[PDB]
Amino acid sequence: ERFYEKXVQKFIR
């Protein structure tokens, strides 16, 4: 499962 926030957030999964 993918999840990230594009300040980068990361949920990497």
Residue listed under structure tokens 């499962």: 1
Given a contact cutoff of 8 angstroms between Cβ atoms, the answer to whether 3 and 11 are in contact is yes
> Cα–chain-centroid distance for residue 3?
4
Given a contact cutoff of 8 angstroms between Cβ atoms, the answer to whether 4 and 10 are in contact is yes
Q: Which token pair is 12? A: 């990497």
Given a contact cutoff of 8 angstroms between Cβ atoms, the answer to whether 10 and 2 are in contact is no
Say how many CA atoms lie within 13 Å of 10 toward its Cβ.
5
Q: How far apart are CA 1 and CA 8, in angstroms?
A: 17
For the chain, give the residues followed by a break (C–N over 2.5 Å). Answer: 6, 7, 8, 9, 10, 11, 12
Residues 6+ apart with CB under 8 A from 13: 1, 2, 3
Q: How far apart are CA 7 and CA 1, in angstroms?
A: 20
